[PDB]
Amino acid sequence: AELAALEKASNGRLGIAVLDTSNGTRIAHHARERFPLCGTYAVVAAAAILARGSLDASLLPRRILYRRYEVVAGSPVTESHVDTGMTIAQLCAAMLQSGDKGAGNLLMRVLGGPQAVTSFAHESGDTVFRLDRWEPELNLAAPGDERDTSTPVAMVDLLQQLLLGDTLREPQRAQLTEWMTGGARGATAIAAGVPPGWRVADKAGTGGYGTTTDVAVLWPPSRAPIVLAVSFTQPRADAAARADVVASAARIATGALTATA
């Protein structure tokens, strides 16, 4: 199989799940095995914020003041706003569009920690997802470690519920979608493998062991969306990431759903 051959040629472990919402078709390769979330947890954390904010109108505009010396590396936006603080909405945008690690930690603190992100996934119907650690340790991606993992199929099903289901009210689904579409530093390897012209709402993740994990909703022109989750992780702690492998997996799967008969 083409996905299996790509995995073998790339010297690592590949997981992919796809759902074609036009007709229910699913594609699966290692879709029920755990892979590191890396920064894809941010989708769930932002969703949890939005759900709360639907009932607490003070939440999204609330200004968070935070300590400078505690902002972790990898925080280009939060580092720049230490003197003024940032609102919760601004933190959500920075986390999703810029992968700002300090923003992720600050929003997790607002929520009650990684365990609160997990709880929101669970109450939203995903009993597989688990976020255990803070930034940046949640991305260590050690082989065999079930912390900070989900499975590709669980990732697809949760992403579809959050962006296309009823967990969030429709304006909140639209806001989450917009945070995942905009930016320029906000694109996945998935996005490089999908046909140009398709609209993409995505969140990228990277970690140790040469890990890339990406989740996306894709809209081909004039067609119901395709939901997919892809992860690739490698045996060496010092392996270089392979964004090109994730892009290739996306190309293969999307092409399979665009075939005629």
PDB file of C-alpha atoms in Angstrom:
ATOM      1  CA  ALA A   1       0.000   0.000   0.000  1.00  0.00           C
ATOM      2  CA  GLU A   2       1.222   3.492  -0.851  1.00  0.00           C
ATOM      3  CA  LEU A   3       1.014   4.860   2.733  1.00  0.00           C
ATOM      4  CA  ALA A   4       2.789   1.756   4.040  1.00  0.00           C
ATOM      5  CA  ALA A   5       5.542   2.139   1.413  1.00  0.00           C
ATOM      6  CA  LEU A   6       5.974   5.817   2.306  1.00  0.00           C
ATOM      7  CA  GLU A   7       6.299   4.886   5.973  1.00  0.00           C
ATOM      8  CA  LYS A   8       8.930   2.241   5.219  1.00  0.00           C
ATOM      9  CA  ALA A   9      10.939   4.535   2.930  1.00  0.00           C
ATOM     10  CA  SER A  10      10.929   7.294   5.554  1.00  0.00           C
ATOM     11  CA  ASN A  11      12.428   5.264   8.431  1.00  0.00           C
ATOM     12  CA  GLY A  12       9.702   5.938  10.993  1.00  0.00           C
ATOM     13  CA  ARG A  13       6.165   5.292  12.172  1.00  0.00           C
ATOM     14  CA  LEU A  14       3.313   6.951  10.274  1.00  0.00           C
ATOM     15  CA  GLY A  15      -0.279   7.317  11.457  1.00  0.00           C
ATOM     16  CA  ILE A  16      -3.095   8.807   9.422  1.00  0.00           C
ATOM     17  CA  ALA A  17      -6.847   8.993   9.657  1.00  0.00           C
ATOM     18  CA  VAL A  18      -9.117  10.716   7.141  1.00  0.00           C
ATOM     19  CA  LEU A  19     -12.879  11.274   7.035  1.00  0.00           C
ATOM     20  CA  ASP A  20     -14.739  12.434   3.907  1.00  0.00           C
ATOM     21  CA  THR A  21     -17.789  14.174   5.346  1.00  0.00           C
ATOM     22  CA  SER A  22     -19.583  14.049   1.988  1.00  0.00           C
ATOM     23  CA  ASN A  23     -20.120  10.283   2.203  1.00  0.00           C
ATOM     24  CA  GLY A  24     -18.605   8.936   5.446  1.00  0.00           C
ATOM     25  CA  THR A  25     -15.577   7.338   3.783  1.00  0.00           C
ATOM     26  CA  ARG A  26     -12.637   6.745   6.116  1.00  0.00           C
ATOM     27  CA  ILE A  27      -8.986   6.048   5.351  1.00  0.00           C
ATOM     28  CA  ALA A  28      -6.828   4.575   8.113  1.00  0.00           C
ATOM     29  CA  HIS A  29      -3.167   3.623   8.517  1.00  0.00           C
ATOM     30  CA  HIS A  30      -2.110   2.968  12.122  1.00  0.00           C
ATOM     31  CA  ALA A  31      -5.163   5.086  12.933  1.00  0.00           C
ATOM     32  CA  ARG A  32      -5.787   3.376  16.304  1.00  0.00           C
ATOM     33  CA  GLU A  33      -2.186   3.631  17.547  1.00  0.00           C
ATOM     34  CA  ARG A  34      -1.105   6.452  19.845  1.00  0.00           C
ATOM     35  CA  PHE A  35       1.087   9.266  18.540  1.00  0.00           C
ATOM     36  CA  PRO A  36       2.339  12.459  20.223  1.00  0.00           C
ATOM     37  CA  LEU A  37      -0.088  15.394  20.108  1.00  0.00           C
ATOM     38  CA  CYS A  38       2.644  18.017  20.172  1.00  0.00           C
ATOM     39  CA  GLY A  39       1.029  21.444  19.655  1.00  0.00           C
ATOM     40  CA  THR A  40      -2.203  20.028  18.234  1.00  0.00           C
ATOM     41  CA  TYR A  41      -3.580  20.086  21.816  1.00  0.00           C
ATOM     42  CA  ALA A  42      -4.005  23.825  21.183  1.00  0.00           C
ATOM     43  CA  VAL A  43      -7.177  23.138  19.193  1.00  0.00           C
ATOM     44  CA  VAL A  44      -8.768  21.572  22.261  1.00  0.00           C
ATOM     45  CA  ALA A  45      -7.474  24.222  24.658  1.00  0.00           C
ATOM     46  CA  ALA A  46      -8.871  27.007  22.462  1.00  0.00           C
ATOM     47  CA  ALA A  47     -12.170  25.159  22.146  1.00  0.00           C
ATOM     48  CA  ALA A  48     -12.407  24.860  25.934  1.00  0.00           C
ATOM     49  CA  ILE A  49     -11.835  28.622  26.255  1.00  0.00           C
ATOM     50  CA  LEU A  50     -14.514  29.317  23.654  1.00  0.00           C
ATOM     51  CA  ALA A  51     -17.022  27.034  25.372  1.00  0.00           C
ATOM     52  CA  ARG A  52     -16.490  28.866  28.672  1.00  0.00           C
ATOM     53  CA  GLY A  53     -16.631  32.227  26.960  1.00  0.00           C
ATOM     54  CA  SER A  54     -20.040  31.448  25.514  1.00  0.00           C
ATOM     55  CA  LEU A  55     -21.436  31.661  29.062  1.00  0.00           C
ATOM     56  CA  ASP A  56     -18.919  34.100  30.621  1.00  0.00           C
ATOM     57  CA  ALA A  57     -18.765  37.223  28.449  1.00  0.00           C
ATOM     58  CA  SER A  58     -15.842  38.496  30.526  1.00  0.00           C
ATOM     59  CA  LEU A  59     -13.514  35.665  29.506  1.00  0.00           C
ATOM     60  CA  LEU A  60     -12.262  36.369  25.964  1.00  0.00           C
ATOM     61  CA  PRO A  61     -11.601  40.094  26.613  1.00  0.00           C
ATOM     62  CA  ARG A  62      -9.957  39.422  30.018  1.00  0.00           C
ATOM     63  CA  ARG A  63      -6.408  40.789  30.181  1.00  0.00           C
ATOM     64  CA  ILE A  64      -3.781  38.379  31.561  1.00  0.00           C
ATOM     65  CA  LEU A  65      -0.742  39.930  33.150  1.00  0.00           C
ATOM     66  CA  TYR A  66       2.091  37.445  33.317  1.00  0.00           C
ATOM     67  CA  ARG A  67       5.644  37.209  34.646  1.00  0.00           C
ATOM     68  CA  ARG A  68       8.359  37.822  32.094  1.00  0.00           C
ATOM     69  CA  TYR A  69      11.029  35.481  33.412  1.00  0.00           C
ATOM     70  CA  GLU A  70       8.564  32.560  33.354  1.00  0.00           C
ATOM     71  CA  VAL A  71       7.743  32.752  29.605  1.00  0.00           C
ATOM     72  CA  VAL A  72       9.219  29.699  27.986  1.00  0.00           C
ATOM     73  CA  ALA A  73      11.344  29.757  24.820  1.00  0.00           C
ATOM     74  CA  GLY A  74       9.267  29.526  21.649  1.00  0.00           C
ATOM     75  CA  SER A  75       7.002  32.463  22.556  1.00  0.00           C
ATOM     76  CA  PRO A  76       7.452  35.187  19.921  1.00  0.00           C
ATOM     77  CA  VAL A  77       4.127  36.933  20.662  1.00  0.00           C
ATOM     78  CA  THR A  78       3.886  36.669  24.447  1.00  0.00           C
ATOM     79  CA  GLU A  79       7.520  37.751  24.808  1.00  0.00           C
ATOM     80  CA  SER A  80       6.664  40.963  22.936  1.00  0.00           C
ATOM     81  CA  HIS A  81       3.660  41.869  25.140  1.00  0.00           C
ATOM     82  CA  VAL A  82       5.051  41.276  28.650  1.00  0.00           C
ATOM     83  CA  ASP A  83       4.659  44.925  29.629  1.00  0.00           C
ATOM     84  CA  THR A  84       1.008  45.174  28.607  1.00  0.00           C
ATOM     85  CA  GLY A  85      -0.271  41.642  29.094  1.00  0.00           C
ATOM     86  CA  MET A  86      -2.587  40.075  26.536  1.00  0.00           C
ATOM     87  CA  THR A  87      -6.274  39.247  26.436  1.00  0.00           C
ATOM     88  CA  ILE A  88      -7.449  35.649  26.441  1.00  0.00           C
ATOM     89  CA  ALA A  89      -8.614  36.038  22.815  1.00  0.00           C
ATOM     90  CA  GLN A  90      -5.193  37.370  21.822  1.00  0.00           C
ATOM     91  CA  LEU A  91      -3.509  34.448  23.610  1.00  0.00           C
ATOM     92  CA  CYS A  92      -5.716  31.986  21.701  1.00  0.00           C
ATOM     93  CA  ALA A  93      -4.708  33.573  18.417  1.00  0.00           C
ATOM     94  CA  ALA A  94      -1.001  33.512  19.305  1.00  0.00           C
ATOM     95  CA  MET A  95      -1.142  29.888  20.442  1.00  0.00           C
ATOM     96  CA  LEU A  96      -2.941  28.725  17.276  1.00  0.00           C
ATOM     97  CA  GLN A  97      -1.389  30.966  14.633  1.00  0.00           C
ATOM     98  CA  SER A  98       2.173  31.315  15.933  1.00  0.00           C
ATOM     99  CA  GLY A  99       2.576  28.187  18.064  1.00  0.00           C
ATOM    100  CA  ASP A 100       3.371  30.493  20.984  1.00  0.00           C
ATOM    101  CA  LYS A 101       4.333  28.172  23.845  1.00  0.00           C
ATOM    102  CA  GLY A 102       3.953  30.790  26.562  1.00  0.00           C
ATOM    103  CA  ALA A 103       0.421  31.454  25.315  1.00  0.00           C
ATOM    104  CA  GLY A 104      -0.360  27.759  25.527  1.00  0.00           C
ATOM    105  CA  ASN A 105       0.878  27.610  29.124  1.00  0.00           C
ATOM    106  CA  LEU A 106      -1.017  30.776  30.076  1.00  0.00           C
ATOM    107  CA  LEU A 107      -4.268  29.426  28.585  1.00  0.00           C
ATOM    108  CA  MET A 108      -3.736  26.093  30.290  1.00  0.00           C
ATOM    109  CA  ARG A 109      -3.338  27.973  33.543  1.00  0.00           C
ATOM    110  CA  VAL A 110      -6.627  29.815  32.870  1.00  0.00           C
ATOM    111  CA  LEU A 111      -8.309  26.448  32.260  1.00  0.00           C
ATOM    112  CA  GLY A 112      -6.804  24.550  35.225  1.00  0.00           C
ATOM    113  CA  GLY A 113      -3.867  22.803  33.570  1.00  0.00           C
ATOM    114  CA  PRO A 114      -3.292  20.067  31.002  1.00  0.00           C
ATOM    115  CA  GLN A 115      -5.803  17.971  32.900  1.00  0.00           C
ATOM    116  CA  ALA A 116      -8.511  20.553  32.131  1.00  0.00           C
ATOM    117  CA  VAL A 117      -7.760  20.283  28.407  1.00  0.00           C
ATOM    118  CA  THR A 118      -8.094  16.496  28.712  1.00  0.00           C
ATOM    119  CA  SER A 119     -11.345  16.857  30.651  1.00  0.00           C
ATOM    120  CA  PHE A 120     -12.788  19.062  27.926  1.00  0.00           C
ATOM    121  CA  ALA A 121     -11.855  16.504  25.257  1.00  0.00           C
ATOM    122  CA  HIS A 122     -13.516  13.783  27.308  1.00  0.00           C
ATOM    123  CA  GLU A 123     -16.703  15.678  27.992  1.00  0.00           C
ATOM    124  CA  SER A 124     -16.776  16.358  24.331  1.00  0.00           C
ATOM    125  CA  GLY A 125     -16.792  12.586  23.678  1.00  0.00           C
ATOM    126  CA  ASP A 126     -13.064  11.717  23.145  1.00  0.00           C
ATOM    127  CA  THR A 127     -11.980   9.096  25.771  1.00  0.00           C
ATOM    128  CA  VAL A 128      -8.570   8.592  24.032  1.00  0.00           C
ATOM    129  CA  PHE A 129      -6.963  12.058  24.026  1.00  0.00           C
ATOM    130  CA  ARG A 130      -4.663  12.771  26.949  1.00  0.00           C
ATOM    131  CA  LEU A 131      -2.640  15.911  27.636  1.00  0.00           C
ATOM    132  CA  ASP A 132      -0.418  15.465  30.681  1.00  0.00           C
ATOM    133  CA  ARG A 133       2.385  18.040  30.623  1.00  0.00           C
ATOM    134  CA  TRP A 134       3.050  21.732  30.061  1.00  0.00           C
ATOM    135  CA  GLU A 135       5.048  23.419  27.309  1.00  0.00           C
ATOM    136  CA  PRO A 136       7.640  22.451  26.201  1.00  0.00           C
ATOM    137  CA  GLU A 137       7.908  18.989  27.867  1.00  0.00           C
ATOM    138  CA  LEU A 138       4.598  17.837  26.385  1.00  0.00           C
ATOM    139  CA  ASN A 139       6.464  17.636  23.026  1.00  0.00           C
ATOM    140  CA  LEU A 140       9.236  15.290  24.150  1.00  0.00           C
ATOM    141  CA  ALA A 141       7.550  12.502  22.177  1.00  0.00           C
ATOM    142  CA  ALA A 142       9.508   9.618  23.685  1.00  0.00           C
ATOM    143  CA  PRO A 143       8.922   6.194  22.095  1.00  0.00           C
ATOM    144  CA  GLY A 144       6.326   4.173  23.932  1.00  0.00           C
ATOM    145  CA  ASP A 145       5.232   7.076  26.150  1.00  0.00           C
ATOM    146  CA  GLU A 146       1.452   7.416  26.288  1.00  0.00           C
ATOM    147  CA  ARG A 147       1.560  10.856  27.902  1.00  0.00           C
ATOM    148  CA  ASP A 148       0.482  13.731  25.632  1.00  0.00           C
ATOM    149  CA  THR A 149      -0.956  11.410  22.954  1.00  0.00           C
ATOM    150  CA  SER A 150      -4.032  10.558  20.991  1.00  0.00           C
ATOM    151  CA  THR A 151      -4.780   8.291  18.037  1.00  0.00           C
ATOM    152  CA  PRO A 152      -5.260   9.611  14.502  1.00  0.00           C
ATOM    153  CA  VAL A 153      -8.884   8.472  14.353  1.00  0.00           C
ATOM    154  CA  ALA A 154      -9.672  10.038  17.739  1.00  0.00           C
ATOM    155  CA  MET A 155      -8.028  13.249  16.516  1.00  0.00           C
ATOM    156  CA  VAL A 156     -10.228  13.269  13.381  1.00  0.00           C
ATOM    157  CA  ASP A 157     -13.380  12.573  15.321  1.00  0.00           C
ATOM    158  CA  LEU A 158     -12.666  15.232  17.952  1.00  0.00           C
ATOM    159  CA  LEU A 159     -11.605  17.827  15.379  1.00  0.00           C
ATOM    160  CA  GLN A 160     -14.800  17.226  13.421  1.00  0.00           C
ATOM    161  CA  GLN A 161     -16.907  17.594  16.574  1.00  0.00           C
ATOM    162  CA  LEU A 162     -15.166  20.834  17.534  1.00  0.00           C
ATOM    163  CA  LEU A 163     -15.155  22.553  14.152  1.00  0.00           C
ATOM    164  CA  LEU A 164     -18.263  20.968  12.566  1.00  0.00           C
ATOM    165  CA  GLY A 165     -20.373  19.562  15.467  1.00  0.00           C
ATOM    166  CA  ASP A 166     -22.366  20.982  18.381  1.00  0.00           C
ATOM    167  CA  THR A 167     -19.763  21.104  21.175  1.00  0.00           C
ATOM    168  CA  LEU A 168     -19.465  24.828  20.446  1.00  0.00           C
ATOM    169  CA  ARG A 169     -22.121  27.248  19.325  1.00  0.00           C
ATOM    170  CA  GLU A 170     -21.818  28.243  15.675  1.00  0.00           C
ATOM    171  CA  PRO A 171     -20.075  31.646  16.211  1.00  0.00           C
ATOM    172  CA  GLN A 172     -17.500  29.882  18.401  1.00  0.00           C
ATOM    173  CA  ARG A 173     -16.931  27.185  15.772  1.00  0.00           C
ATOM    174  CA  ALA A 174     -16.391  29.998  13.275  1.00  0.00           C
ATOM    175  CA  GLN A 175     -13.899  31.741  15.573  1.00  0.00           C
ATOM    176  CA  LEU A 176     -11.925  28.538  16.165  1.00  0.00           C
ATOM    177  CA  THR A 177     -11.902  27.873  12.437  1.00  0.00           C
ATOM    178  CA  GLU A 178     -10.664  31.405  11.716  1.00  0.00           C
ATOM    179  CA  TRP A 179      -7.824  31.110  14.238  1.00  0.00           C
ATOM    180  CA  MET A 180      -6.800  27.879  12.454  1.00  0.00           C
ATOM    181  CA  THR A 181      -6.954  29.427   8.977  1.00  0.00           C
ATOM    182  CA  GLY A 182      -5.236  32.724   9.414  1.00  0.00           C
ATOM    183  CA  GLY A 183      -1.684  33.578  10.203  1.00  0.00           C
ATOM    184  CA  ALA A 184       1.263  32.824   7.965  1.00  0.00           C
ATOM    185  CA  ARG A 185       3.265  30.895  10.527  1.00  0.00           C
ATOM    186  CA  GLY A 186       0.078  28.843  11.078  1.00  0.00           C
ATOM    187  CA  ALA A 187       0.253  26.218   8.250  1.00  0.00           C
ATOM    188  CA  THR A 188       0.889  22.453   8.533  1.00  0.00           C
ATOM    189  CA  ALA A 189       2.850  20.021   6.400  1.00  0.00           C
ATOM    190  CA  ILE A 190      -0.642  18.753   5.526  1.00  0.00           C
ATOM    191  CA  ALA A 191      -1.268  22.060   3.789  1.00  0.00           C
ATOM    192  CA  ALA A 192       1.728  21.520   1.467  1.00  0.00           C
ATOM    193  CA  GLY A 193       0.251  18.231   0.226  1.00  0.00           C
ATOM    194  CA  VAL A 194      -3.280  19.331  -0.536  1.00  0.00           C
ATOM    195  CA  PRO A 195      -4.412  20.737  -3.843  1.00  0.00           C
ATOM    196  CA  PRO A 196      -3.980  24.488  -4.171  1.00  0.00           C
ATOM    197  CA  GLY A 197      -7.258  26.286  -3.982  1.00  0.00           C
ATOM    198  CA  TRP A 198      -8.591  24.167  -1.123  1.00  0.00           C
ATOM    199  CA  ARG A 199      -9.338  26.056   2.069  1.00  0.00           C
ATOM    200  CA  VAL A 200      -7.416  24.746   5.094  1.00  0.00           C
ATOM    201  CA  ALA A 201      -8.002  25.111   8.807  1.00  0.00           C
ATOM    202  CA  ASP A 202      -5.052  23.428  10.491  1.00  0.00           C
ATOM    203  CA  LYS A 203      -2.764  23.196  13.503  1.00  0.00           C
ATOM    204  CA  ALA A 204       0.817  21.899  13.277  1.00  0.00           C
ATOM    205  CA  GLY A 205       2.790  20.240  15.985  1.00  0.00           C
ATOM    206  CA  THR A 206       6.453  19.237  16.306  1.00  0.00           C
ATOM    207  CA  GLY A 207       8.475  17.500  18.975  1.00  0.00           C
ATOM    208  CA  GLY A 208      11.411  15.293  19.869  1.00  0.00           C
ATOM    209  CA  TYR A 209      12.189  12.101  17.954  1.00  0.00           C
ATOM    210  CA  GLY A 210      11.723  13.946  14.686  1.00  0.00           C
ATOM    211  CA  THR A 211       7.957  14.092  15.329  1.00  0.00           C
ATOM    212  CA  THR A 212       5.435  16.037  13.267  1.00  0.00           C
ATOM    213  CA  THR A 213       1.719  15.851  14.116  1.00  0.00           C
ATOM    214  CA  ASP A 214      -0.774  17.889  12.117  1.00  0.00           C
ATOM    215  CA  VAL A 215      -4.568  18.110  12.152  1.00  0.00           C
ATOM    216  CA  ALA A 216      -6.724  19.815   9.549  1.00  0.00           C
ATOM    217  CA  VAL A 217     -10.126  20.385   8.045  1.00  0.00           C
ATOM    218  CA  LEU A 218      -9.956  20.796   4.265  1.00  0.00           C
ATOM    219  CA  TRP A 219     -12.596  22.289   1.984  1.00  0.00           C
ATOM    220  CA  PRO A 220     -12.247  21.473  -1.701  1.00  0.00           C
ATOM    221  CA  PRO A 221     -14.183  23.921  -3.884  1.00  0.00           C
ATOM    222  CA  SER A 222     -17.930  23.383  -3.727  1.00  0.00           C
ATOM    223  CA  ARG A 223     -17.538  20.198  -1.635  1.00  0.00           C
ATOM    224  CA  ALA A 224     -18.172  19.038   1.946  1.00  0.00           C
ATOM    225  CA  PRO A 225     -14.969  19.015   3.988  1.00  0.00           C
ATOM    226  CA  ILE A 226     -12.389  16.346   4.593  1.00  0.00           C
ATOM    227  CA  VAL A 227     -10.997  15.913   8.110  1.00  0.00           C
ATOM    228  CA  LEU A 228      -7.578  14.452   8.685  1.00  0.00           C
ATOM    229  CA  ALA A 229      -4.910  13.825  11.241  1.00  0.00           C
ATOM    230  CA  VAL A 230      -1.365  12.736  10.418  1.00  0.00           C
ATOM    231  CA  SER A 231       1.620  11.982  12.629  1.00  0.00           C
ATOM    232  CA  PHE A 232       5.122  10.791  11.836  1.00  0.00           C
ATOM    233  CA  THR A 233       7.684   9.915  14.501  1.00  0.00           C
ATOM    234  CA  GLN A 234      11.139   8.385  14.297  1.00  0.00           C
ATOM    235  CA  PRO A 235      13.339   6.022  16.331  1.00  0.00           C
ATOM    236  CA  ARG A 236      16.318   8.379  17.004  1.00  0.00           C
ATOM    237  CA  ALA A 237      15.968  11.132  19.584  1.00  0.00           C
ATOM    238  CA  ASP A 238      18.057  13.242  17.236  1.00  0.00           C
ATOM    239  CA  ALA A 239      16.108  12.504  14.035  1.00  0.00           C
ATOM    240  CA  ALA A 240      15.329  15.416  11.732  1.00  0.00           C
ATOM    241  CA  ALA A 241      11.625  16.077  11.216  1.00  0.00           C
ATOM    242  CA  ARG A 242      10.070  15.041   7.920  1.00  0.00           C
ATOM    243  CA  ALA A 243       7.375  17.585   7.075  1.00  0.00           C
ATOM    244  CA  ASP A 244       7.607  16.295   3.508  1.00  0.00           C
ATOM    245  CA  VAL A 245       6.418  12.853   4.624  1.00  0.00           C
ATOM    246  CA  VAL A 246       3.350  14.331   6.295  1.00  0.00           C
ATOM    247  CA  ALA A 247       2.662  16.351   3.114  1.00  0.00           C
ATOM    248  CA  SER A 248       3.015  13.202   0.989  1.00  0.00           C
ATOM    249  CA  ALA A 249       0.610  11.292   3.231  1.00  0.00           C
ATOM    250  CA  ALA A 250      -1.915  14.129   2.863  1.00  0.00           C
ATOM    251  CA  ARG A 251      -1.472  14.153  -0.916  1.00  0.00           C
ATOM    252  CA  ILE A 252      -2.054  10.403  -1.094  1.00  0.00           C
ATOM    253  CA  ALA A 253      -5.171  10.469   1.061  1.00  0.00           C
ATOM    254  CA  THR A 254      -6.769  13.546  -0.522  1.00  0.00           C
ATOM    255  CA  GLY A 255      -6.091  12.207  -4.003  1.00  0.00           C
ATOM    256  CA  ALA A 256      -7.784   8.953  -3.034  1.00  0.00           C
ATOM    257  CA  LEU A 257     -10.917  10.896  -2.099  1.00  0.00           C
ATOM    258  CA  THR A 258     -10.851  12.882  -5.408  1.00  0.00           C
ATOM    259  CA  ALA A 259     -10.735   9.825  -7.705  1.00  0.00           C
ATOM    260  CA  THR A 260     -13.451   9.206 -10.305  1.00  0.00           C
ATOM    261  CA  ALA A 261     -14.822   5.760 -11.277  1.00  0.00           C
TER     262      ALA A 261
END
